[model samples]
Target: GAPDWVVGDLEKVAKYEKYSGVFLGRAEDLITNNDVDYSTNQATAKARANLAANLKSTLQKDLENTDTEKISQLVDKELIASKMLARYVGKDRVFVLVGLDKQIVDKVREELGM
Candidate 1:
């Protein structure tokens, strides 16, 4: 992500101009805040939820349309990314929930459940 000043500028545009009005900023803040310990955990949960809602199609295609395979890969990617992102953000639990979400997708939740 960009620096705070850049984000603030974007927020201003979102607040005053754009129709969507910087909805992502709210999401970003909610997902990652420096003051929050275990931000990584929260971020992972948010990422999994967000992926369930948004990245299913992309992961589906990447996994060649096999739901199980897609979910497996999704988990792998999220775990790797979570580790990296947690380190980047200087948080410990950053992507824990993201990995859990993959397990849910793989074995816990049926397609209908999602």
Candidate 2:
């Protein structure tokens, strides 16, 4: 079970950011602290982290000339969903589901004991 503090923090974030803060923080902590160890591998975490960085960067760039609130809302919905999806799928499953090359999948499977 999740800790009470975590649940409360997530609730607070959700109350203000509507789920974006919760999802983003989850993904960031996973990436920054290396959350995927037994389930996937370091390589998978690295890829997810890179993708997260790229998405945030792209959104920031695109929103530079626009309203921050609109951008935040847009990203809160779209990017947060994408991040949550990626978080749910794990590293090994993402490529397989996305129809990527088999080599990485095979490697992840081997490393993750799948």
Candidate 3:
């Protein structure tokens, strides 16, 4: 299980950019010797799902009124380009921390005229 502080720390950093809300992006996996199998590991899958769900929920308001296809593509691109602020690990587990910039969010909104 992820530590409670993981999200706590993320929220604190989100405050750094005051105008827009911060959304968390995370990915994790168990340490394993099987190189190929690591890519399909359960922990990795769960982490990605968690990040995607969080992103969608964080942008729920914008998503509701925007073109789903276009917004989804933009969000995906931003997520891929987002800055990773921190990473942590525990025993056999690995974790990554990433975030989308407020300016990016605002720009997207303005472009969509939302």
Taking all chains together, each candidate's TM-score versus the true structure is 0.28, 0.26, 0.60
* Candidate 2: residue 97 lDDT (0-100): 8
TM-score for candidate 2, residues paired by index: 0.26
Per-residue C-alpha lDDT of model 1 across residues 4-109, encoded as one tens digit per residue: 3223553244344332311221122233445554564455556545534444544455444246565655444544332112222422222221222234334423
Misplaced by over 4 Å in model 3 are 1-4, 7-22, 34-53, 63-66
Better of 1 and 2 by TM-score: 1
lDDT score for residue 105 of model 1? 39
Candidate topping lDDT:
3
Model 2 residue pairs with clashes = none
lDDT of 3 by residue, 29-63 (tens): 76677443453354444544565566555565664
Name the Cα RMSD for model 1: 11.7
Task: Pick the winner on lDDT between candidates 2 and 3.
Answer: 3
Q: Would you give me the overall lDDT of model 3?
A: 0.57
- lDDT string for model 2 (30-111, tens) is 3334444433344344434544454445455644444434434433333322332233433333210001222432332333
C-alpha lDDT score of every prediction, in listed order: 0.38, 0.35, 0.57
